[model samples]
Target chain A: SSQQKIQAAEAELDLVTDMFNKLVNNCYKKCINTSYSEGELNKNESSCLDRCVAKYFETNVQVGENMQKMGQS
Target chain B: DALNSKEQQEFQKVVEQKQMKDFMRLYSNLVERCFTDCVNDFTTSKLTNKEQTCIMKCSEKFLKHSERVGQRFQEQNAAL
Candidate 1:
């Protein structure tokens, strides 16, 4: 195996899993209640999760763009 | 810029291994998260109806969440 290739793949996976874990953590905090009152997600909770996902993604992209812009200089 | 057949095969194996590990990790994460959130009662050996329903919903929501995030990530990467 090319050590370089292996390292590159690992690096990409690291980025993805980091992003995924962050998304899950943030959305859980924003949308979930610790109390399990019912089996199903209430309407508001489900909607909140949906909106949370959108906003999180938007925020990530915004931050990424700014980082790239700053790095270019 | 050039990878011989041997190197190509080795790289492919590495990629496959990384993919499998990622899948396993993500699966466990989902299980841990949903179980922690939904399963509170230990009254019976089997899951209660409410717990089962909550688990089902939690799993569905999590998968949907993952899918949406992947799509958004692709879009963002493409724009770069």
Candidate 2:
């Protein structure tokens, strides 16, 4: 009924919230620094942040594929 | 106790699948974050105090950011 449907919606939303939760901290750590004392990124931090974003995106896609595989298997 | 309709079952299935996918993503990202800022110079196989401190502070900061965003998000959702 609506119960399970609402539950599903809630669960999905929770996942998005959780995903966002980790995303910020990781980005901050890899791309940001206290040493900068500014809002702008230096050359090294830019690349580090780029790499971090790429890895996270790649990991997200891989996880989706693997989960589908698990479901089928 | 719950009995799902066809549509509900379908939604629940998708949600469960997404949960697995998202959990894996979170796991991999967390590891990468810890690895990135915390681990450098593989001179030692163990986590030094420096690495430990970095990971702890980074994680704490991240969670706080998440919570703040979460607060704002919920507020928006409620407003709509």
Among incorrect, acceptable, medium and high, the docking class of model 1 is acceptable
Residue-level lDDT tens digits of model 2 in B1-80 = 23455566766676687768766766677677667765776887788886777777656544444444445445444543
lDDT of each residue in B19-67, candidate 1, tens digit only: 7887788789889987898888887889988788878877776666666
lDDT of 1 by residue, A1-73 (tens): 5777667766876786778678767776776775555445567866676677678778977988898988672
TM-score, each model?
Answer: 0.64, 0.44
Best by the lDDT measure: 1
- How far out, in Å, is residue A20 in model 2? 5.0
Q: What value does the TM-score of chain B take for model 1?
A: 0.77
Candidate 1 colliding pairs: none
Candidate 2: tens digits of C-alpha lDDT, residues A1-73: 5766577577656776676556556666554664323233356654555566567666877888898988672
Q: What is the lDDT of residue A44 in candidate 2?
A: 69
